[PDB]
Each structure stands twice: as C-alpha cells, then as structure tokens.
insulin
Amino acid sequence: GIVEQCCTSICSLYQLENYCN
Amino acid sequence: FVNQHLCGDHLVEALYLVCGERGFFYTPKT
C-alpha cells in the first residue's frame, strides 16, 4: 500500500489515505 | 506536504497527518 510505491518509489499522500484511514 | 520519497518514520508521521483522525492502519508492520 505505501512502502515500495511511495517510500521506495513515489505515490505519497495521495496514496497514504488509502491505508491510513 | 512532501509528496515524494518519504519512509518508515516520516511515512507513518505522514499516514497520521493524512488519516490521523480517521483510524491509522499503519501496518505495513512486523
């Protein structure tokens, strides 16, 4: 959901939602 | 906010910043 897409890659905040919720 | 390469700590900090009032399913954990 976040890690190798937004940390070790990039989709950050937009994505965050999708799991933080 | 810093919509690029944020990890582990900065990343959770962010998860919270984003849905910290919602739930907070930061696991992605061990």
About this structure: Residues 8-19 of chain B form the longest helix (12 residues). Chain B has one domain: 1-30.
